[PDB]
Design a protein around this ligand. Structure first.
Ligand SMILES: [Zn+2]
Lengths: 397, 98, 397, 397, 397, 133
């Protein structure tokens, strides 16, 4: 594996620093490294493919070095080089792709392909270098057994979940009390509704609560918390819990009362915020708990009083809500987020080559399914597969 | 500076060539194919039957092969072993050039 | 052009690696490269500016070299250097800006300024080095013709479009059926409404469809798809199609039925998702087609039944919708997105110097106008201009 | 300060470029730099911690150097090295953290800890190297005195503010006119409402305006401007200005008329856009002014006419709005944004070690409080503290 | 690719310049070039075909060279040569054809076949020469990138479109007003009709307009513009817009009044002609706009007056029209025209060998479909495929 | 005038028969002709434009010759050449255009521009070639 990495920063820091002009002395430390490779290779036979729509191309080697020592790089030098790189490019592609489709439960955090199983070989180890690519940096630290770490803008930690829970309901669904929400990606919106506007509730206050359990701990999270759930602020006709009928939701929004957000880790409160809207920091948590209340307005102008009668029918449904968005965070496990193309790269290569569903990943690399049952095997395979996608993107986008 | 593995011939095909597939300096590279060819272009039937194997008009007077044989030489001046070496070597080469 | 690049990574990898302390060896390979430049320069004169509110300044070159002599850089070494760099800084700025304004149809792609037309000259090429800046990496590959590629976040592919289409309407606008939408940036929200709640529709289902044609293909897109269009979930008074009057929209939202999203490429379905909300991957497409239906609820509680009578007036308007957001994607053509400052840099320099409208770009570099008619000339000019902006941002932000 | 930096790119460009395999000529320029350090160190005693729940550890040195012989790196070489790096890692951590807590007031922009006050010492300066980390790049340019600058995605310039202003009101709150808004992070949503639908207004048009003053100038901003304020498009029961009662808001949305956005700098209009929705560029501004109007529809279908009677009660409240989002921008001062983890890192280290509230920063490093009163002292301390967080993240995430 | 080219001008400038008797000297520069080839070849093997009713032939090499110092070539010399050429002829055919059907999307602009993918190889570049064949001349310039271009007679820029637009109509279709047209190839004919002969129109003049948007810009166009649309000057029975019935068109032709032709480029008028019939030049445009009017004759002899009553029935339908033909033009993109056989060659080879429909081109290489959705992929594939057809036509017609 | 012609078939039969990897033999008779030109030029300065919206770009000459050495053209040979042709291209354009506007009644059939009036000069005639256009 680490092998693989080099093969690239080799080419990038190559197809990039090697252009008509520059002095030799700008690549002395580079040229060398390069050659070293060619040698180790020359002679060894290879094969890639054998699955779905993936060609089976063979690769033979027999190349010379670069002794042409001329102060300044003359055009002629480049072309005689680019022609030798374009075989490694078109190669690596066919290499990444081959080990980017095979999966394994007996452990996938390891080489699978007849291409790579031969790379981890010892005689090839003579190649590694410049591991400043965020992903490899993390691959190593892991295979040595120690704390990892990655960066994400609008991470994708919440499997899609859009539902409701009726805490008080009746057949006619004309006097309900409960919550409805949408957990998806890095965002949570939750609304608490009480058709009776807490008319018979103790202290004329109805308590609500929404708990979300992350499948992985997030640390150093920058979060936006805002009152109101716009998504649940409009009239809706919804299916009943049993699917037998439909109910009507006609919200009128009030400010959430006694808002308390707790970011817990293993049941312990790590961060707690009382009615603080705007930007807040949650430094380490595996659970978010949002508690908020609907308090019947003690003083009401006529127009307001008219919405909340002492007796049914209750036609305007008092609703309070919250919106929470994780802008950025760090996770010790790889995850999809709103900026990185890893998930999309892996998913795209598999789709393009009609790769059959395997034993580890859900059909279509479905994110919701993956994060919902994020087993150790799926994570090890995902990390291997994400790290390869990142190696590939250094050369092929 | 190329293959510091000096070489290793048992008896393949055209031990002089083969170098082309593995040499990075075009000038050097043309010499090889041209020399590994110019098979004495054995095909002539003149002035009323005369199998007299001819050869490149190229060679003829178009000469250049020479000019190329030289230009390829004009860029072989580099390191590897003791100094009493390149010194003596390239100096000789130049005497071909001038 | 490539010339230009170097001039910078030269200075950055300079104004950065050269300070009171460091040991020679980390810059030996660097110092060299540097000097080489100075030489090539000295003697030549340049013409920068001469348009709008742009200062016309002349530049002469006559500077020393460097003291490879010392071991560990002494303060005195720096200052005598920084003073020589600050002429190149204040220079390049005036250089970028000059070619970051001119445009031409026929040969729009190539350099235009009396400053740059002289740079592409041959006697200068002796400068290139370390081309790892994502943008140049892509400039080159393009002059050779290959599968280029750029990375974005909330890309800006959709020209602003906010409108509606009434499939069934009448003068009173009291029983309409159609769709309304907002396509902007990387997001699409579309709602289908049927004032009659499919009372007389076959199978009591009204079909809707929204098609969006991208001006450029997007590959490796990570997309969020959610049910409902919040933007079209509230009461509105809208202008009629002919502008002669205004109609009333009073939505009540139902779940979109039989949702199907197709990402097509040249008329072919590349990806298709049936009712899958959350995160989905669209690997290569130039068109998005969203199909969804409004199905009259077969079972209704009294409160719901009351909203949907058998006869007009129809006072609650059944509405179903979808929201689609492209979080990230790759495009072979430069585009504006939510993270890169290129468009803003180019637009800002032109605005600050009162640069007159030219023959290629729309007034004010207006994004909507640009992407709506993204001609080859506009793209070549945009890429040239974006690449220069990126070269400039390595030194001046 | 600059000292500190090196200590890291030293280790990263180390724990990265030094693995089982690579040839020596890939790091010759590197090894050297490294050793140089060791020397300067060994013999000097350090001390860290002491405040709050932060341990107090002592450090001593007399570590060996590194063989500059072997051609290929043998495993044995690595391990005898990693063991020496893991003391510097676990060290630096304890170093950053120590100076990532103390605060001054005047001259609070400089070093504070008994650990760092000794680093700025002269005998240590023999270490600086490769300053290509966006943040240090900017620290230096500032020390000397120049035009700094950073890159932000969805920046955090607006302190949280959610309120309203009633321009026309009466006890019953049955015929109000005014605006309500939410300024938070990089977004602004503002709605103008007129319960009377401009029935008695000149030209049947009610003018609205929303002004937002940034605490710092933003340059090169890419902004999304859209009509409508979804957040204020639904029914609400709101507290009166004096908190004595609650009023009812029942919006119906109309298109904002004569929209004009001005981005001003010191009272001067730098950019102005008239009714342009989509993506716009604001190149340099410290104030945003949004002006928009509600124009009573001159022609109304019956359904619309019914919402707007000539006399009270006014039951449907005409509302027009705007949404503005700053996707990206450059600021000369450090700020929190939606991608960088700096604020979260600083806030997290302080929270984890129970660091007492100091004299500079608001309790909990509260962003809203910080940006609301962004004094020079808070900014200098924030920059110092953010730069240290960035140095730390090169090694520890 | 460029490789391919040579292989031909090699043979043509061969099977042509090498005849019984010619003095030697005029071929010396030729013979040479030739041999060079043979060498490079002999030894390498090739694969041809493998799709549809496309034979699968194999090839080998080892052919003697050619004499040098002779004088006048004896018959015997020819025959021993023609026999060696006839293997290359029958070869190339089988080569062109093989890469003249394969299509790729991601990178369908480059080589595909197992035959050609091996030609672009480096060890082959040893051949390229005499690139004066209009098409290759343009292939290269596109590779390096620049003002490419081709020459066409009666070009094929307009996808077939024959329709009408009724601006005033009623169920009986007895008093219509609108336009009908035929856009096809390089020609446009458009007629404006007004059954009422502008009896109630302001100034007794009815305005008409026809806009045609080209899929590619045409430059240096020589155009014939004539008054009248003969195609729409005769009685017709036409299907109604909804296909439910048929209407009667009984035209009587009047001279088009205030004719104005505008050739626009990106919305800008590049050329404008007012009532100028005959030959006009449009130097650069992507859109043509034809505006013309029907003016009721202010003075009418009895016979004329009788055709145009003050009241219905309107039995003679006043019609004005224009005819525009692009005789020649230059386009930066390949197009079909009335003289070149490229499209026909490509289409014919595919039809003859029963080549299956691929992912890029419309079924049957249908021109209208192709030009209607002339995507970048279709254009790159079309150019590759047209260039190959042109290489083939140098030897095989 | 006839002068002008050559300047082109020179470049076409040039930018065409000079590719990334060919034989000298294809151009010996060509290379020569080419150089001959360069010589005659270098040293003479030119002016074009001066009317309507026609820029006035000025030109100097001082270009090297051509490697008469090689057999097969190494890439490096091309680029060092294309860079010298692209000055003649962008030149001729500005030349044609200049004499493609000035009309003259009397002696209208003849040359006009300060660019061409200098071309018909005798010291230039040393260039005509392949007039099959
Ligand atoms: Zn974002």
């Amino acid at each position: 594996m680490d092998v693989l990495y080099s093969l690239s920063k080799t080419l990038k820091d190559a197809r990039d620093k090697i252009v008509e002009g520059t002095l030799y002395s700008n690549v002395s430390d580079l040229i060398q490294q390069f050659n070293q490779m060619i040698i180790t290779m020359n002679g060894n036979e290879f094969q890639t493919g054998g699955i779905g729509n993936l060609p089976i191309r063979n690769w033979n080697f027999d190349f010379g070095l670069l002794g042409t020592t001329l102060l300044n790089l003359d055009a002629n030098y480049v072309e005689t080089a680019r022609n030798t790189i374009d075989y490694f490019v078109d190669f690596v592609d066919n290499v990444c792709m081959d080990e980017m489709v095979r999966e394994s439960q007996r452990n996938g955090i390891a080489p699978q392909s007849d291409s790579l199983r031969k790379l981890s070989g010892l005689k090839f180890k003579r190649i590694n270098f410049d591991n400043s690519s965020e992903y490899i940096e993390n691959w190593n630290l892991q295979n040595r057994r120690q704390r990892t770490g990655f960066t994400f803008h609008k991470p994708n930690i919440f499997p899609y979940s859009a539902s409701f829970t009726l805490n008080r309901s009746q057949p006619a669904h004309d006097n309900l009390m409960g919550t409805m929400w949408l957990n998806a990606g890095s965002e949570i919106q939750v609304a608490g509704f009480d058709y009776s506007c807490a008319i018979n509730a103790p202290a004329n206050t109805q308590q609500f609560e929404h708990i979300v359990q992350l499948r992985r701990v997030l640390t150093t999270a920058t979060i936006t918390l805002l009152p109101d759930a716009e998504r649940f602020s409009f009239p809706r006709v919804i299916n009943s819990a049993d699917g037998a009928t439909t109910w009507y939701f006609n919200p009128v929004i009030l400010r959430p009362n006694n808002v308390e957000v707790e970011f817990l880790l293993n049941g312990q409160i790590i961060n707690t915020y009382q009615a603080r809207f705007g930007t807040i920091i949650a430094r380490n948590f595996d659970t978010i708990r949002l508690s908020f209340q609907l308090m019947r307005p003690p003083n009401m102008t006529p127009a307001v009083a008219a919405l909340f009668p002492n007796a049914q029918p209750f036609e305007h449904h008092a609703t309070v809500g919250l919106t929470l968005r994780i802008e950025s965070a760090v996770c010790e496990s790889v995850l999809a987020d709103a900026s990185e193309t890893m998930l999309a790269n892996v998913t795209s290569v598999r789709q393009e080559y009609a790769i059959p569903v395997g034993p580890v990943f859900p059909p279509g690399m479905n994110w919701t399914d993956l994060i919902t049952n994020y087993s150790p095997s799926r994570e090890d395979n995902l990390q291997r597969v994400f790290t390869v996608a990142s190696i590939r993107s250094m050369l092929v986008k | 500076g190329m293959q510091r593995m000096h070489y290793r011939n048992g008896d393949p095909q055209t031990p002089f060539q083969i170098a082309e597939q593995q040499i990075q300096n075009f000038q050097v590279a043309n010499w090889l194919h041209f020399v590994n060819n110019n098979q004495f272009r054995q095909v002539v039937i003149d002035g009323v039957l005369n199998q007299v194997l001819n050869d490149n008009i190229r060679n003829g007077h178009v000469i250049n092969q020479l000019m190329e044989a030289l230009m390829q030489l004009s860029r072989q001046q580099f390191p590897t072993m003791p100094v009493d070496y390149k010194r003596s070597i390239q100096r000789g080469i130049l005497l071909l050039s001038n």
